[PDB]
Design an enzyme around this catalytic site. Structure first.
Site, short mmCIF file in Angstrom:
data_model
loop_
_atom_site.label_atom_id
_atom_site.label_comp_id
_atom_site.label_asym_id
_atom_site.label_seq_id
_atom_site.Cartn_x
_atom_site.Cartn_y
_atom_site.Cartn_z
N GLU A 159 2.79 11.21 -5.95
CA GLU A 159 1.99 10.14 -5.33
C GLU A 159 0.49 10.39 -5.36
OE1 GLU A 159 3.15 7.27 -4.57
OE2 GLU A 159 5.29 7.57 -4.19
N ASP B 28 -1.44 0.53 -5.85
CA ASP B 28 -0.38 1.36 -6.41
C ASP B 28 0.06 0.85 -7.79
OD1 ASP B 28 1.42 -0.77 -5.99
OD2 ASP B 28 2.44 0.18 -4.31
#
Ligand code: IBF
Ligand code: CL
Length: 162
Positions: free
Chosen positions: A11, A20
């Site tokens: 991440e 994202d």
């Protein structure tokens, strides 16, 4: 290696609001804020999560706090689901981490489509499960990460994160 280090690799860490892989406002270590295209909505969700007026920027400590909560929530979500719990319980600790990783990325109902993969994982048919997991939007959209997670399911080792 552990679930925290694993998800930290997959991440990353960003202290300002970013989008994202799906184009959704996110902060910290993959903390999804909202699916709304409104930055203001995202900032509101951020403020709500942190408990102060942030204007889109947080500290490392704040990011790590959200991360701890998110990992906790992912695990709890698995155990709360009467159908997912047995699969999770059947796994060793390394593969459990791989399960948490997927839940973290897509949500336990984003994993709704993985019923067939889960069955093979419970059967410990590792190569077959690995092949099945790759037949997914997930794999096609995030292949490098999916490959790492799948290798973790295939081998029960941390080799993909070395
Ligand atoms: F309980 C489980 C989940 F919720 C899950 F998403 C995956 I991937 C698993 F492999 C699992 F065992
Ligand atoms: Cl990569």
């Amino acid at each position: 290696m552990n679930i925290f280090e694993m998800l930290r690799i997959d991440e990353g860490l960003r202290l300002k609001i970013y989008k994202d892989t799906e184009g959704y406002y996110t902060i910290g270590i993959g903390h999804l804020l909202t699916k709304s295209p409104s930055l203001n909505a995202a900032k509101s969700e951020l403020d709500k999560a942190i408990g102060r007026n942030t204007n889109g920027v947080i500290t490392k400590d704040e990011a790590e706090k959200l991360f701890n909560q998110d990992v906790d929530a992912a695990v709890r979500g698995i155990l709360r689901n009467a159908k997912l719990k047995p699969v999770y319980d059947s796994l060793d600790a390394v593969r459990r981490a791989a399960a948490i990783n997927m839940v973290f990325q897509m949500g336990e109902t984003g994993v709704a489509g993985f019923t067939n993969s889960l069955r093979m994982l419970q059967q410990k048919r590792w190569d077959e499960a690995a092949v099945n997991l790759a037949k997914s939007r997930w794999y096609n959209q995030t292949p490098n990460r999916a490959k790492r997670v799948i290798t973790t399911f295939r081998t029960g080792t941390w080799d993909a994160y070395k």
